[PDB]
Amino acid sequence: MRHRKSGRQLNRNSSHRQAMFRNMAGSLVRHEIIKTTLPKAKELRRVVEPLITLAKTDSVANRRLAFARTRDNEIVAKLFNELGPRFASRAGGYTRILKCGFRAGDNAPMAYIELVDRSEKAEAA
Amino acid sequence: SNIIKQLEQEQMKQDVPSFRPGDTVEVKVWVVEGSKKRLQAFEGVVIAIRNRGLHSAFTVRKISNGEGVERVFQTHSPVVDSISVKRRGAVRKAKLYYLRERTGKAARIKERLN
Amino acid sequence: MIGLVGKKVGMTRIFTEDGVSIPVTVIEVEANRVTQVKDLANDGYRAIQVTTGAKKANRVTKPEAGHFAKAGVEAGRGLWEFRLAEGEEFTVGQSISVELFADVKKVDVTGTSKGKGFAGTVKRWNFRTQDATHGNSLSHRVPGSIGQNQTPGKVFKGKKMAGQMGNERVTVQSLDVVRVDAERNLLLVKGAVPGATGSDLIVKPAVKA
Amino acid sequence: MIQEQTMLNVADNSGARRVMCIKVLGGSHRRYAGVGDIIKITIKEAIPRGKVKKGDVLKAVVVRTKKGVRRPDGSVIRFDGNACVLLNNNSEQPIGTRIFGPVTRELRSEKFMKIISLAPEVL
Amino acid sequence: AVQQNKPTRSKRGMRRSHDALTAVTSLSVDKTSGEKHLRHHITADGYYRGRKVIAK
RNA sequence: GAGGACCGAACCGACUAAUGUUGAAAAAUUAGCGGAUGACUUGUGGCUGGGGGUGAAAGGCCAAUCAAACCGGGAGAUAG
RNA sequence: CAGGUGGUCAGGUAGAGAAUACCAAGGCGCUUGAGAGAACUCGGGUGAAGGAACUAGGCAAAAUGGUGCCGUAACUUCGG
RNA sequence: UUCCUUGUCGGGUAAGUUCCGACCUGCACGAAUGGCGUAAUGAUGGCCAGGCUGUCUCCACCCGAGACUCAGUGAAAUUG
RNA sequence: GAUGUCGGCUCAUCACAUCCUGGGGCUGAAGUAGGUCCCAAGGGUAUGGCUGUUCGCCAUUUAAAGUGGUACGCGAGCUGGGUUUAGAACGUCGUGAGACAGUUCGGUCCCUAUCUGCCGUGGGCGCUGGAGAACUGAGGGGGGCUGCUCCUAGUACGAGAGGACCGGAGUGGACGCAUCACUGGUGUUCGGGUUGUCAUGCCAAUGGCACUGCCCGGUAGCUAAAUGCGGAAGAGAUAAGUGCUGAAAGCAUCUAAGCACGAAACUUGCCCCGAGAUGAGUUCUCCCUGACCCUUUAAGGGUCCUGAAGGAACGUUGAAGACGACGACGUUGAUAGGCCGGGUGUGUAAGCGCAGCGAUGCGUUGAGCUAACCGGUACUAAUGAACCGUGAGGCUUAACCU
């Protein structure tokens, strides 16, 4: 049974899931849009969006705590210097999942996931 | 839900004192033996506390006549007449289950000294 | 007597002043509105059809909407029938409240038990597990033998096997009514009733003693 | 929650120190015995000059369990060990004259009033 | 365990009576580019509900 | 500083269990197990040939082959 | 093709160690994936109270486990 | 090694066709196809005790690999 | 040209020559307790020690520890102790090779389910216009056990000892169903402690790996040992049995006419499934009221127009689930995620300050973090459409209206 349980297993063990979502979260904030399978994309929301909420309050405690979740200072810098202020007024829902075709190699349902404010002015840096 | 919590808050006691795991408390319960009802005291160490609103509970451990006794009280039950803290202990944990394996001087708890 | 349709709110406990904890199930019983009355002349049996709760107008279909408009009541989340005993009279549109159980002492609660999905014979039929060691080969929770040799040459109908467990209609009988709160549409019965939180319950007076 | 093969301490002064439950009385296929239940026991260890000796088969009433008892308000009373009191095999009366350690009020019955009156502490 | 008699081509066809594929009912039409696409999926050129969502 | 000495890796072995049994494998894997300076183990080369060899002996082994190897021949043996 | 295959080389931290753990140099992720999170099977983790009642049998599992010091029985071929 | 046989008696257990001690009535022991003892040794046989435990009372939950669904590839025994 | 052989385990099912419970007759039946026979198969019907054992003996229970059939039920379900290969030994027999239901130690148990069957769960079509609901209940299944104490009453009975029927009340065992409020288990998705090592430049702080490294706690969910409930009462017809009236047969006679009792069996009553019940039922509601041509002229074919009720699909999903299915929701929106608040759990983060030679301690501080929970919140994702489904629904007769 599975009643009221949350979180997908994704045919991995616990340590692999944690490492994968840590890498995938870092790639999302680095490129602001990535392409992955639809199940992985839906679970990524419960990982990256808490990091953006954390990055709204800049402090050495939050920075270290964010570093513990990502283990990448380049990622932590962008979270607190760019994504924090960019989402200061938005109350959750910082990502957007756009379904697309199926992967050619295995017919997996693919989907784009991006930050919502990835507008025409993002080309500055 | 709003319905159930409304039914529970009207049964909860309003004067339950604050106590932490590691404090020695004296609980007075109602003992009915027919037409009489007296208060029996039960003093010991609080080794666990369950905070669940109306379903809150705490278990007290004491060494009585060489036998270790643990008793789990339902803190909002009308059986529990009163609760008084005798001394405040200083522990690092929330569940003092390791006290079951210790005795005498090994089961001593530093006073919180607040 | 007729019954009522309520919703399982959850479980809690009631402390009696003499120091007894009564595990109760909270059943939200809003006003049950009579939508149709059946009689021997037109239907061949006496019964009422009630609805309860509310429903968004965009989710009711035209066939259902016309049925509620015929009765002049607001659309509920479903329809349930109750066989009328001899002497009970009800009119369409009449609302029935929880205070009908004011003097009722024991009730029978009917609901849909929680679904366990595909269940093995150990869980579904309380079969005994075979040996975990002592040479057992891949046969720890299997059902074992399912019949006799050639003489029957078949498996008898009704054999206990693995399959869907739960998610079916279940009635618990003779539950004590702890409290009837009319002004809050609450009914507290002692014990546990089938179904998950939020499922619909049918509460009738106890058919037995 | 005592079953067969369970070793119990003795809460009286009849002379036995360790007994083993060999039967839970009072019903076919009965599995456990709680506080207040009669069991058949054998004596596995006794003091040199007690009223009973190693090997006798008697009855006993369970007075303390690690599983504990449940009170009508939902409380529990657990003990650190299982203990019983030896009874005469046919008269069901306590053999010893003293009781050690506390007991519970589940024994509050005319059948075990002798034990309640002798107990140092009733819980 | 194995068959005692060769199943027929009739029995084989009956088993495959549920193997038929279900074609997609109907494709959606984008309001801006007018392209066809799976409903709730972006178009082949990166449009979704009349918006260029990916510039590739 | 003796030992067919002790504990224990490599190495050699194969006691138990599970798995596998149209296997990953025509004998293995996993977890434990025995010996581990010796009657030890291993490389390269050599010798012993079928009623023969070799055998700390199980009729064991002698190219996935053994109460008499394999290949060709007698040979289309004979078959109430 | 989870097997077999002789010899040489032998970094760091911990360690008695060529055990073991984590790493360096260096090399790899084992040539189907994607989901789901039923029974059941396999490999594991934890378990109230009881503690061999299991079973042909404590099979399996659990447990014990190091160094120093104290201390150590019958029996003995005087070494154990 | 004993058929009768679970011999009889004692010990161990609440209860012991096994075990240990004895008896001698050795169906059918017996002295280098050795007799009787025997410290040490044994992946040897039997039995007992402590510890330990999901072995069990009586199973529960959990983590993984399959099973299940989708895409690709694509067997087998058997068959009037 | 193979039908695997004992016992055990698991799972059973039937018979009745009945072990218990139920109903009776007789008794050398005072009572209690029995003996024996008749009726009765609804349910129930031990755990251990020894042995491969079936059995049996023994210990201790129980209302009772029934007897049999089912390939001495059940190895394409398990086991492999026994029996029945190859090794070895003893006694014994034989000159010997060897042999012995004599003994002893050791000794590979394969199969991915086509069909029948069975447990579940769908698709199709049918049920005569279509659709959405609510039912009826033909029929089927489940369930059916029992102890002890108390009152009646120390009464009836009995010299005493002892000790009831009938009736009532309470409380257990075993079994079943449901549930998670409590007590707990689990909780590799929460918090903390800690060993070794590597890394993040270093300190500090963290992360990786070592079975989740080892541990201590623990939310939701699942769950039992946890706690609620269940077995009935009643009714009908009876079995054995007991009768009333009553002839045949002046009497007698329970029977031949007639009438009354009578059991856990039977039929109901309780629970569940159930109209594919093709004998395809009933009730309520909703939807559709265009043309035209052809032909062999009919339950005919075709074109144009039209596309309803509703359905499906797709999406967000669920205490629903293998997949289908089922449920909720899709901006007129709380369906999921996020976010906000709370709760819960863990137990006083980091940073800084102070004390100390230092390990560390103290203050800020019940701090920080917090999964599945609760209450909110359109921030993100659930799209305008498209698709399927049509256009008043045969014949005959009868009663009604025209």
mmCIF file of N, CA and C (backbone and C1' of nucleotides) in Angstrom, chain I residues 263-286:
data_model
loop_
_atom_site.group_PDB
_atom_site.id
_atom_site.type_symbol
_atom_site.label_atom_id
_atom_site.label_comp_id
_atom_site.label_asym_id
_atom_site.label_seq_id
_atom_site.Cartn_x
_atom_site.Cartn_y
_atom_site.Cartn_z
ATOM 1 P P A I 263 -38.217 -26.680 19.720
ATOM 2 O "O5'" A I 263 -36.677 -26.940 19.431
ATOM 3 C "C5'" A I 263 -35.780 -27.202 20.495
ATOM 4 C "C4'" A I 263 -34.496 -27.813 20.002
ATOM 5 C "C3'" A I 263 -33.773 -27.068 18.897
ATOM 6 O "O3'" A I 263 -33.009 -25.987 19.393
ATOM 7 C "C1'" A I 263 -33.819 -29.386 18.416
ATOM 8 P P A I 264 -33.029 -24.566 18.652
ATOM 9 O "O5'" A I 264 -31.527 -24.358 18.182
ATOM 10 C "C5'" A I 264 -31.025 -24.985 17.013
ATOM 11 C "C4'" A I 264 -29.577 -24.635 16.806
ATOM 12 C "C3'" A I 264 -28.947 -25.094 15.505
ATOM 13 O "O3'" A I 264 -29.210 -24.198 14.441
ATOM 14 C "C1'" A I 264 -27.493 -25.538 17.332
ATOM 15 P P A I 265 -30.159 -24.612 13.220
ATOM 16 O "O5'" A I 265 -29.777 -26.124 12.918
ATOM 17 C "C5'" A I 265 -28.550 -26.467 12.292
ATOM 18 C "C4'" A I 265 -28.686 -27.737 11.501
ATOM 19 C "C3'" A I 265 -29.544 -27.626 10.252
ATOM 20 O "O3'" A I 265 -28.802 -27.198 9.128
ATOM 21 C "C1'" A I 265 -30.321 -29.415 11.559
ATOM 22 P P C I 266 -29.209 -25.863 8.340
ATOM 23 O "O5'" C I 266 -30.623 -26.210 7.710
ATOM 24 C "C5'" C I 266 -30.763 -27.239 6.743
ATOM 25 C "C4'" C I 266 -32.187 -27.340 6.271
ATOM 26 C "C3'" C I 266 -32.821 -26.025 5.849
ATOM 27 O "O3'" C I 266 -32.516 -25.692 4.510
ATOM 28 C "C1'" C I 266 -34.276 -27.172 7.317
ATOM 29 P P U I 267 -32.005 -24.222 4.133
ATOM 30 O "O5'" U I 267 -33.334 -23.356 4.097
ATOM 31 C "C5'" U I 267 -34.428 -23.741 3.283
ATOM 32 C "C4'" U I 267 -35.629 -22.876 3.547
ATOM 33 C "C3'" U I 267 -35.337 -21.408 3.782
ATOM 34 O "O3'" U I 267 -35.153 -20.692 2.577
ATOM 35 C "C1'" U I 267 -36.827 -22.188 5.435
ATOM 36 P P U I 268 -34.351 -19.307 2.588
ATOM 37 O "O5'" U I 268 -35.355 -18.305 3.300
ATOM 38 C "C5'" U I 268 -34.877 -17.253 4.117
ATOM 39 C "C4'" U I 268 -35.958 -16.732 5.025
ATOM 40 C "C3'" U I 268 -35.574 -15.532 5.868
ATOM 41 O "O3'" U I 268 -35.693 -14.315 5.160
ATOM 42 C "C1'" U I 268 -36.590 -17.153 7.241
ATOM 43 P P G I 269 -34.473 -13.277 5.139
ATOM 44 O "O5'" G I 269 -34.439 -12.706 6.621
ATOM 45 C "C5'" G I 269 -35.567 -12.045 7.171
ATOM 46 C "C4'" G I 269 -35.462 -11.955 8.668
ATOM 47 C "C3'" G I 269 -34.174 -11.351 9.200
ATOM 48 O "O3'" G I 269 -34.199 -9.937 9.206
ATOM 49 C "C1'" G I 269 -34.636 -13.356 10.352
ATOM 50 P P C I 270 -33.176 -9.106 8.294
ATOM 51 O "O5'" C I 270 -31.766 -9.357 8.978
ATOM 52 C "C5'" C I 270 -31.463 -8.801 10.245
ATOM 53 C "C4'" C I 270 -30.007 -8.981 10.572
ATOM 54 C "C3'" C I 270 -29.043 -8.641 9.451
ATOM 55 O "O3'" C I 270 -28.773 -7.256 9.375
ATOM 56 C "C1'" C I 270 -28.462 -10.729 10.386
ATOM 57 P P C I 271 -28.690 -6.522 7.953
ATOM 58 O "O5'" C I 271 -27.250 -6.906 7.411
ATOM 59 C "C5'" C I 271 -26.082 -6.491 8.097
ATOM 60 C "C4'" C I 271 -24.855 -7.153 7.532
ATOM 61 C "C3'" C I 271 -24.689 -7.054 6.027
ATOM 62 O "O3'" C I 271 -24.142 -5.819 5.613
ATOM 63 C "C1'" C I 271 -24.326 -9.278 6.713
ATOM 64 P P C I 272 -24.604 -5.163 4.227
ATOM 65 O "O5'" C I 272 -23.789 -5.975 3.133
ATOM 66 C "C5'" C I 272 -22.374 -5.960 3.129
ATOM 67 C "C4'" C I 272 -21.821 -6.986 2.178
ATOM 68 C "C3'" C I 272 -22.362 -6.936 0.763
ATOM 69 O "O3'" C I 272 -21.754 -5.938 -0.028
ATOM 70 C "C1'" C I 272 -22.381 -9.160 1.523
ATOM 71 P P C I 273 -22.560 -5.282 -1.246
ATOM 72 O "O5'" C I 273 -22.498 -6.386 -2.385
ATOM 73 C "C5'" C I 273 -21.256 -6.797 -2.931
ATOM 74 C "C4'" C I 273 -21.423 -8.006 -3.813
ATOM 75 C "C3'" C I 273 -22.403 -7.858 -4.958
ATOM 76 O "O3'" C I 273 -21.852 -7.180 -6.071
ATOM 77 C "C1'" C I 273 -22.796 -9.900 -3.850
ATOM 78 P P G I 274 -22.739 -6.128 -6.893
ATOM 79 O "O5'" G I 274 -23.944 -6.998 -7.455
ATOM 80 C "C5'" G I 274 -23.728 -7.977 -8.457
ATOM 81 C "C4'" G I 274 -24.930 -8.867 -8.629
ATOM 82 C "C3'" G I 274 -26.226 -8.174 -8.996
ATOM 83 O "O3'" G I 274 -26.320 -7.862 -10.370
ATOM 84 C "C1'" G I 274 -26.630 -9.673 -7.238
ATOM 85 P P A I 275 -27.438 -6.837 -10.883
ATOM 86 O "O5'" A I 275 -28.556 -7.776 -11.507
ATOM 87 C "C5'" A I 275 -28.224 -8.754 -12.486
ATOM 88 C "C4'" A I 275 -29.086 -8.633 -13.717
ATOM 89 C "C3'" A I 275 -29.026 -7.283 -14.425
ATOM 90 O "O3'" A I 275 -29.241 -7.481 -15.819
ATOM 91 C "C1'" A I 275 -31.230 -7.711 -13.766
ATOM 92 P P G I 276 -28.010 -7.720 -16.814
ATOM 93 O "O5'" G I 276 -27.636 -9.246 -16.596
ATOM 94 C "C5'" G I 276 -28.522 -10.288 -16.976
ATOM 95 C "C4'" G I 276 -27.750 -11.413 -17.602
ATOM 96 C "C3'" G I 276 -26.533 -11.857 -16.804
ATOM 97 O "O3'" G I 276 -26.838 -12.897 -15.892
ATOM 98 C "C1'" G I 276 -25.881 -11.327 -19.015
ATOM 99 P P A I 277 -27.157 -12.574 -14.354
ATOM 100 O "O5'" A I 277 -28.724 -12.805 -14.226
ATOM 101 C "C5'" A I 277 -29.252 -14.116 -14.077
ATOM 102 C "C4'" A I 277 -30.711 -14.191 -14.449
ATOM 103 C "C3'" A I 277 -31.151 -13.276 -15.587
ATOM 104 O "O3'" A I 277 -32.137 -13.942 -16.368
ATOM 105 C "C1'" A I 277 -32.433 -12.815 -13.663
ATOM 106 P P U I 278 -31.706 -14.849 -17.621
ATOM 107 O "O5'" U I 278 -31.379 -13.796 -18.762
ATOM 108 C "C5'" U I 278 -32.366 -12.874 -19.196
ATOM 109 C "C4'" U I 278 -32.669 -13.019 -20.665
ATOM 110 C "C3'" U I 278 -32.750 -14.448 -21.191
ATOM 111 O "O3'" U I 278 -33.751 -14.504 -22.200
ATOM 112 C "C1'" U I 278 -31.155 -13.253 -22.421
ATOM 113 P P G I 279 -34.903 -15.613 -22.131
ATOM 114 O "O5'" G I 279 -35.857 -15.106 -20.968
ATOM 115 C "C5'" G I 279 -36.844 -14.115 -21.216
ATOM 116 C "C4'" G I 279 -37.379 -13.529 -19.934
ATOM 117 C "C3'" G I 279 -36.356 -12.786 -19.083
ATOM 118 O "O3'" G I 279 -36.999 -11.710 -18.410
ATOM 119 C "C1'" G I 279 -37.250 -14.580 -17.846
ATOM 120 P P A I 280 -36.989 -10.245 -19.053
ATOM 121 O "O5'" A I 280 -35.461 -9.821 -19.007
ATOM 122 C "C5'" A I 280 -34.828 -9.533 -17.774
ATOM 123 C "C4'" A I 280 -33.525 -8.821 -17.992
ATOM 124 C "C3'" A I 280 -33.597 -7.565 -18.838
ATOM 125 O "O3'" A I 280 -34.024 -6.438 -18.101
ATOM 126 C "C1'" A I 280 -31.830 -8.911 -19.601
ATOM 127 P P G I 281 -34.813 -5.252 -18.832
ATOM 128 O "O5'" G I 281 -36.150 -5.099 -17.986
ATOM 129 C "C5'" G I 281 -37.120 -6.134 -17.949
ATOM 130 C "C4'" G I 281 -37.837 -6.166 -16.624
ATOM 131 C "C3'" G I 281 -38.229 -4.812 -16.056
ATOM 132 O "O3'" G I 281 -39.451 -4.336 -16.585
ATOM 133 C "C1'" G I 281 -37.135 -6.069 -14.390
ATOM 134 P P U I 282 -39.629 -2.786 -16.958
ATOM 135 O "O5'" U I 282 -39.819 -2.072 -15.553
ATOM 136 C "C5'" U I 282 -40.839 -2.486 -14.661
ATOM 137 C "C4'" U I 282 -40.701 -1.805 -13.326
ATOM 138 C "C3'" U I 282 -40.621 -0.291 -13.366
ATOM 139 O "O3'" U I 282 -41.895 0.314 -13.470
ATOM 140 C "C1'" U I 282 -38.928 -1.134 -11.957
ATOM 141 P P U I 283 -42.074 1.688 -14.276
ATOM 142 O "O5'" U I 283 -41.501 2.787 -13.286
ATOM 143 C "C5'" U I 283 -42.059 2.964 -11.996
ATOM 144 C "C4'" U I 283 -41.205 3.878 -11.162
ATOM 145 C "C3'" U I 283 -40.832 5.195 -11.810
ATOM 146 O "O3'" U I 283 -41.863 6.157 -11.722
ATOM 147 C "C1'" U I 283 -38.913 4.222 -10.851
ATOM 148 P P C I 284 -42.060 7.231 -12.893
ATOM 149 O "O5'" C I 284 -40.920 8.301 -12.618
ATOM 150 C "C5'" C I 284 -40.871 8.994 -11.384
ATOM 151 C "C4'" C I 284 -39.566 9.722 -11.211
ATOM 152 C "C3'" C I 284 -39.140 10.612 -12.361
ATOM 153 O "O3'" C I 284 -39.815 11.853 -12.391
ATOM 154 C "C1'" C I 284 -37.303 9.328 -11.645
ATOM 155 P P U I 285 -40.155 12.539 -13.801
ATOM 156 O "O5'" U I 285 -38.773 13.171 -14.259
ATOM 157 C "C5'" U I 285 -38.085 14.085 -13.425
ATOM 158 C "C4'" U I 285 -36.647 14.229 -13.842
ATOM 159 C "C3'" U I 285 -36.414 14.625 -15.285
ATOM 160 O "O3'" U I 285 -36.572 16.013 -15.500
ATOM 161 C "C1'" U I 285 -34.988 12.837 -14.723
ATOM 162 P P C I 286 -37.068 16.551 -16.924
ATOM 163 O "O5'" C I 286 -35.776 16.439 -17.838
ATOM 164 C "C5'" C I 286 -34.576 17.097 -17.472
ATOM 165 C "C4'" C I 286 -33.425 16.642 -18.324
ATOM 166 C "C3'" C I 286 -33.639 16.739 -19.819
ATOM 167 O "O3'" C I 286 -33.428 18.046 -20.310
ATOM 168 C "C1'" C I 286 -32.712 14.634 -19.289
#
